[PDB]
Design a protein around this ligand. Structure first.
Ligand SMILES: CO[C@H]1O[C@H](CO)[C@H](O)[C@H](O)[C@H]1O
Ligand SMILES: CO[C@H]1O[C@H](CO)[C@H](O)[C@H](O)[C@H]1O
Ligand SMILES: CO[C@H]1O[C@H](CO)[C@H](O)[C@H](O)[C@H]1O
Ligand SMILES: CO[C@H]1O[C@H](CO)[C@H](O)[C@H](O)[C@H]1O
Ligand SMILES: CO[C@H]1O[C@H](CO)[C@H](O)[C@H](O)[C@H]1O
Ligand SMILES: [Ca+2]
Ligand SMILES: [Ca+2]
Ligand SMILES: [Ca+2]
Ligand SMILES: [Ca+2]
Ligand SMILES: [Ca+2]
Ligand SMILES: [Mg+2]
Ligand SMILES: [Mg+2]
Length: 432
């Protein structure tokens, strides 16, 4: 009945060993956990909760050992009352850092069960197969990273310099062949471009891909596979103002339109410096969002319990189009107490925003512990507010997600959302 209100990170949880995703069977967010190909579905968006639980965006279920000893791990109902049991709580152990093939620094850690002290584990040694708990053995297949794409660099539709047409996916489900088409106010034409080189379709969550593996061929949308032929550079040398070429990292060929009129099928071709090989990002300006905490309630002589709703205020309906613009804006950068936040904060916040769009879900939430972990005996409950302005109109948007910090202080938490209060009064932070 109660979602995770103090999340620390949201994204794919990956094996340090194989780089495969930690996967719940099917797409509903319940059932056995094992490694699988990363597939872009919401059940693979794992939520690292500040309360120790590990949940997912498909359903409010918890990573749960099916018994004592070296047991199987599955996604099962979370036990919240009288308290979350230590068997459904996990801590990060030892850490391993590495740079992935997209050039992004990742941080892997052991994931340790609080009841048993056993490690989240993949069968055998190769980092593929069934997932459960086992004695910690220091091996790579007991280390897991929440995947970072690096910074979101650019976003929007992609308009060809020659034709004024937009980069398009056939149909409207964001799947299949990419070609030029009339610019349309549909998600299947909206793309988000990351430091890891991925260009991601907003409708399908899938990647701008070249057929086969050599980076020379027809371009379409396919399962993000982390391969070099789905990585793209946007080098300054090829930019003319805001119109730039996109070079495939596998073949060094340019994102290209058939012929020279900017009107046909899209593939990769030898770069030629012609206008049909340049594209501009088309998007509305929104102000860098700001994060603040609002007091929901205080109790100096015990716990505080409140109704916590997801609310959004704006000048008009937050359309699917407005929602992807805001998501993209958030991921690009957010300010907290006049400082930027880390890549995982903006990535997680934008994922929370997206998941917030179809309800939600007013909840009765109680401050049982301080965000810093100690038992809550007095203080205040604080709810996040995210604010931004659409520059063209001057219209302010305010989002109050179901994201809460419990602290001992009447002073607002000193920590960004998706970071952990280090002390009861929350004056400094960890897990930033
Ligand atoms: C056929 O795929 C389905 O089940 C597998 C496990 O077999 C994965 O969980 C995948 O995400 C889900 O869509
Ligand atoms: C028999 O040991 C093997 O399987 C267990 C789980 O059964 C663990 O994955 C362990 O690391 C692996 O060496
Ligand atoms: C009937 O048009 C449909 O397919 C074309 C491609 O032929 C475009 O992708 C358009 O967005 C879609 O509605
Ligand atoms: C059959 O798979 C191959 O082609 C598809 C396009 O059909 C993708 O590019 C994939 O990466 C590649 O391995
Ligand atoms: C035969 O060349 C023509 O088509 C190819 C793709 O087939 C490229 O678009 C190239 O720029 C164009 O001159
Ligand atoms: Ca799945
Ligand atoms: Ca193992
Ligand atoms: Ca289309
Ligand atoms: Ca491919
Ligand atoms: Ca061409
Ligand atoms: Mg399992
Ligand atoms: Mg194509």
């Amino acid at each position: 009945q109660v979602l995770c209100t103090n999340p620390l990170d949201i994204g794919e949880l990956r094996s340090f060993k194989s780089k495969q995703c930690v996967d719940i069977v099917g797409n509903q967010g319940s059932g056995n956990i094992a490694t699988y190909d990363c597939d872009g579905l919401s059940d693979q968006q794992i939520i690292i909760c500040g309360d120790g639980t590990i949940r997912n965006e498909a359903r409010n279920y918890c990573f749960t050992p099916d018994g004592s000893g070296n047991a199987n791990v599955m996604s099962s109902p979370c036990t919240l009352y009288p308290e979350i049991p230590s068997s459904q709580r996990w801590r990060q152990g030892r850490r391993k850092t590495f740079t992935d093939n997209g050039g992004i620094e990742q941080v892997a850690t052991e994931i340790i069960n609080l009841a048993s002290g056993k490690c989240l584990d993949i069968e055998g040694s190769d980092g593929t197969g069934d997932i459960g708990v086992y004695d910690c053995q220091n091996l790579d297949d007991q280390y897991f990273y929440v995947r970072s794409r690096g910074p979101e660099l650019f976003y929007g539709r992609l308009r060809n310099e020659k034709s004024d047409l937009c980069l398009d996916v056939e149909g409207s489900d964001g799947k299949g062949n990419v070609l030029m088409y009339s610019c349309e106010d549909n998600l299947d034409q909206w793309f988000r471009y990351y430091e890891n080189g991925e260009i991601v379709n907003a409708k399908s969550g899938m990647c701008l891909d070249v057929e086969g593996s050599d980076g020379s061929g027809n371009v379409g949308i396919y399962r993000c596979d982390d391969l070099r032929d789905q990585m793209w550079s946007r080098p300054n040398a090829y930019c003319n103002g805001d119109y730039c070429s996109f070079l495939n990292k596998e073949s060094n060929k340019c994102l290209d339109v058939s012929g020279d009129q900017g009107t046909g099928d899209v593939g990769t071709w030898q770069c030629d410096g012609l206008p049909d090989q340049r594209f501009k990002w088309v998007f509305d300006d929104w102000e860098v969002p700001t994060a603040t905490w609002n007091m929901v309630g205080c109790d100096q002589n015990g716990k505080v319990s409140q109704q916590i709703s997801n609310t959004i205020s704006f000048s008009s309906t937050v359309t699917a189009g407005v929602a992807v613009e805001v998501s993209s804006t958030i991921e690009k950068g957010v300010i907290f107490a006049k400082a930027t936040v880390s890549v995982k904060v903006t990535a997680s916040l934008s994922k929370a925003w997206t998941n917030s769009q179809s309800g939600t879900t007013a909840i009765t939430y109680t401050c049982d512990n301080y965000d810093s972990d100690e038992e809550f005996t007095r203080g205040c409950m604080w709810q996040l507010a995210i604010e931004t302005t659409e520059v063209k109109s001057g219209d302010l948007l305010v989002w109050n997600p179901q994201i809460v910090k419990c602290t001992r202080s009447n002073t607002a938490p000193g920590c960004a959302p998706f970071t952990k209060c280090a002390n009861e009064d929350c004056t400094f932070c960890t897990d930033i």
